[PDB]
Design an enzyme around this catalytic site. Sequence first.
Site, PDB file in Angstrom:
ATOM      1  N   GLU A  56      28.395  13.524   3.721  1.00  0.00           N
ATOM      2  CA  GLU A  56      29.172  12.760   2.374  1.00  0.00           C
ATOM      3  C   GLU A  56      30.414  12.806   2.383  1.00  0.00           C
ATOM      4  OE1 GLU A  56      28.983  14.239  -2.147  1.00  0.00           O
ATOM      5  OE2 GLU A  56      27.530  12.648  -1.957  1.00  0.00           O
ATOM      6  N   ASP A  78       5.700  17.972 -15.937  1.00  0.00           N
ATOM      7  CA  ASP A  78       6.563  18.798 -17.183  1.00  0.00           C
ATOM      8  C   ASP A  78       7.966  18.101 -17.255  1.00  0.00           C
ATOM      9  OD1 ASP A  78       7.283  17.893 -14.379  1.00  0.00           O
ATOM     10  OD2 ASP A  78       7.926  20.178 -13.304  1.00  0.00           O
ATOM     11  N   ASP A 101       8.239  16.072  -8.808  1.00  0.00           N
ATOM     12  CA  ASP A 101       7.732  17.459  -7.950  1.00  0.00           C
ATOM     13  C   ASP A 101       7.491  16.999  -6.403  1.00  0.00           C
ATOM     14  OD1 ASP A 101       7.493  18.156 -10.362  1.00  0.00           O
ATOM     15  OD2 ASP A 101       6.063  19.666  -9.482  1.00  0.00           O
ATOM     16  N   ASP A 124      26.217  17.545   2.187  1.00  0.00           N
ATOM     17  CA  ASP A 124      27.385  17.242   1.211  1.00  0.00           C
ATOM     18  C   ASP A 124      28.784  17.900   1.351  1.00  0.00           C
ATOM     19  OD1 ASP A 124      26.565  16.336  -1.632  1.00  0.00           O
ATOM     20  OD2 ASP A 124      27.945  18.220  -1.918  1.00  0.00           O
ATOM     21  N   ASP A 167      19.147  18.470   2.875  1.00  0.00           N
ATOM     22  CA  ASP A 167      20.774  18.544   1.668  1.00  0.00           C
ATOM     23  C   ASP A 167      21.257  19.423   1.851  1.00  0.00           C
ATOM     24  OD1 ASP A 167      22.906  17.324   0.347  1.00  0.00           O
ATOM     25  OD2 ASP A 167      21.981  15.969  -0.682  1.00  0.00           O
TER      26      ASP A 167
END
Lengths: 550, 540
Positions: free
Chosen positions: A254, A25, A29, A199, A98
């Site tokens: 973060e 693509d 992945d 984050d 994350d």
Amino acid sequence: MKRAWWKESVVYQIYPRSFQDSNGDGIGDIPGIVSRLDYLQELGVDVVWLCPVYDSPNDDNGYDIRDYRRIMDEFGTLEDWERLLEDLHARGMKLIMDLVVNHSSDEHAWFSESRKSRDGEHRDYYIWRDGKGGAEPNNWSSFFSGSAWKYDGETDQYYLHLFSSKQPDLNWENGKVRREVYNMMAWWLDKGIDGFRMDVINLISKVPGLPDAPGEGRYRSGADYFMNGPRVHEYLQEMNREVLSRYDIMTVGETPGVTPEQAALYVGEDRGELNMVFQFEHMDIDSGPGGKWDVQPWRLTDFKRVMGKWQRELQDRGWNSLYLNNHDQPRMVSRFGDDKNFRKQSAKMLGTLLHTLQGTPYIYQGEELGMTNVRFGSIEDYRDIETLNMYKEATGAGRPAEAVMASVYSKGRDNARTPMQWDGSAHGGFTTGTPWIASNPNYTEINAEDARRDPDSIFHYYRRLIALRKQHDVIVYGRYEALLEEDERIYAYTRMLDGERLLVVLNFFGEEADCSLPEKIRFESAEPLIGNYGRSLKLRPYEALVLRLQ
Amino acid sequence: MKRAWWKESVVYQIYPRSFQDSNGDGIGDIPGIVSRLDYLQELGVDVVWLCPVYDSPNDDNGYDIRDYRRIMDEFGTLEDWERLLEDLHARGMKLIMDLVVNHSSDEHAWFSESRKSRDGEHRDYYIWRDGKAEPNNWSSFFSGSAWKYDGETDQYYLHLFSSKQPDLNWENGKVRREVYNMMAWWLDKGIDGFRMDVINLISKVPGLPDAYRSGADYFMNGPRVHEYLQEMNREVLSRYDIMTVGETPGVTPEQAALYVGEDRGELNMVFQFEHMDIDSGPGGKWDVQPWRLTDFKRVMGKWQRELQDRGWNSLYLNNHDQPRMVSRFGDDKNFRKQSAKMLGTLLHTLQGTPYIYQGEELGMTNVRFGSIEDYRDIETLNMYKEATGAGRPAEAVMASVYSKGRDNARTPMQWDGSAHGGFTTGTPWIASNPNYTEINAEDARRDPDSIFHYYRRLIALRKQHDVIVYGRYEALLEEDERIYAYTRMLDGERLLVVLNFFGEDCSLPEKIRFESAEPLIGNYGSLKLRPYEALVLRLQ
């Protein structure tokens, strides 16, 4: 002070999109990550931090999440992900996730329910306010471009979008919001993820009165009111108490524009908040007063100060994260080193720094290969809601394009999100087809194979930086005390633990400098644990040596 | 939840200036407090809270401290003070101290060093900023701006309360560290608590925002209150056995929980001003408006129910900054006695630490002096000046002063029927209410059916039943706008507190089944009604 694994751990940051592609693509992945896993284990990485791999509209590459409990279609399926956890847990390694939680997608069931009316429960999940004088309720700006408020006629009010219009900020001043945040965390933590990178955690709380920004202007910073918010610490302690505690994990956050002392309330041993945080204070050495784009000359001293300051300040109780490049930031071998003259050497010493400094080293994709910032011909070759919004606006202000591009070339984010360079074939053997972003034509020079082949390679230096890290306690836990601080060409410090000493002398320029060592640092046993080049005060260009004084 | 003395304690607030004078100066002295100490012991008061008694220019009457380690010359000497502590500790009683740490004085050693230059260490002990004109459109609590300019430094300084109350920089350790020392200085001597002044106004939003108007959003319930209080608690408050109440303006039940919470390790209790804005309106305190008993009951119940499980409520309906209750929420003219007694029952049969202010036990009334000249409050006399500038009708301005003024509560306490109700031999600093020929201590101590003895009886039963202190709160007939009824239950013990907040049907519910009527106390010595009546029936 106290011992823990995350302290003597090395985290490798993986941007999925441009790591490894397994379906042609062009978009990287998770299964592609699985294919390359032997690379990381050979390097000696202990922990792996995949950037967001959740269901997103892909306006900001995964940070706007439509569904939290579903893997992004482009990356793979939960199984493909489960493999990576297993393989990693089987290779003796760990996975970090994350946590993007102050803001959600427009497409999230909540927002689609929020905007519906002023009566639905989901209305207060996001910060909806009324317009101040037929415009936005404050002079706060989005980070990418323009206002941080977008209007909705169905409700006739604005919604807080401190980032993209597709990233509606969440009202953490709602128990329901927070409670749901904990569930999804548990949902993943129940599955055995070995840590949560959070984050913009300090953006979770906003000053209650949603104030405007003194300084006026068209649209200005609300960083005084959203950043380092009032209830930030109130929530994290809930999060720890509510979710983080019941699991054995690692937690980095973060936190942009945080002072060491503010950090101590995040990173503090007894605070019970997070384990470590990402300060951006050393990311504004090259940056100036106008913004990140204001690239300015930088003083090694003032760099050393912010590094040392942070090292000394959080030393006694607390833990420093060591990072010079992430997916949001330009690459280091170029930034603080010679991408052209001494790429290899530059990277080796800069790597030495983060590895012979106290804290948890972070490595970003390609750091080990000495990847360089990218300079594509046109803007079209770029794809970042910041870059192509700073361009549009600045060009709309009549600003010279060459100037606007010069800023994109040095401070851009896609300078780091280029298809990683594994081999010398098309697209550095990342995608079989065409990449979502052009690959740097450096792969015929900068690649993984060459590294794994070349014994005197950047890869093999970092290997050894990690190798000695596991073989000496001084490196992880040892005290920090700088030398020749005033010197603007040599960064020298000492790491000592118990009786063990380490002398890390570094040269941040391409000139053979004078290693005029002090006497305070006496020695009768020179023991060079590692060296860029395999009393000779003549230190070679961009050289770095970690002599063990012992 | 947990047990502690301050929970089953009754604090009596003493405004020193107008308590008792023992040198004919007019200004009330600490030794004067010592003279009258037998009064408080009789009443049943367990803890005594003297308002600020420290060296001050007396601009805001003690809330402007020039030296923290010295007793105000007008009040006495440290010894005279030490006696009160000893006597009180010897009568089985306790002393609370006022902690005015938010704002220092201009005459303090620091400010006099701060204003000197931009180089001295003391410069960052206060909030000095550059103008923008002035830094922000914030306004002071008395009048005008919250910034005063100094030419020596060519900058403004934050003065939220008064130009003689320079606000202190709590983002400086040296400031905070010194705060802790003085606290320890007094705590080392054995003071049995600390009432803290505008505790939530210690931390200001870092960027000193613009909002003349209220900057409450930034100074109030600021970003580092809970940060500092934990430090303070850790550094000093934890090291001594004390009780601490905090003057927290505009705190919601949830914001309090972070201050009052058991596990937060901050403050034992706080003073919410949310039930002081039932009569007040949207423009300010002076916007006296009609008030609904339901909405009153709500704020009382809300707070009672919210902090119940973990936390402690302070019960207060009048302080030195607020008008008197027998008048405010009662009939000062028609049923002073009854209004006074039912209003006291509330704060004594509700869960929390009851606070009594001077003269509450005598049912003292708000004062209405002829002229403004008969008044002496920086807030009162600064609004009047401002209002004349905007051309406000003096009649309306005084009508505000008469109801919402602070000097209503600071009149010389009425002990007897001689000149000045036996407060000062000479002339009082503020005229005494002429009610002392009616409202006085002697009459109370004489009259068996007096307000004094009802409060005493309320204090007594409080010590004789655990339900009163620790019992669960649940209200009844909540919609009813005339009857304030609630139940206090603990273990198996129940209490039915039916109250009539006006002068004029006790249709009791069945949910409250009783097969044992036991009227512990009653305003006036089945279902009925009576004017400003209050009965605490122990259903059991």
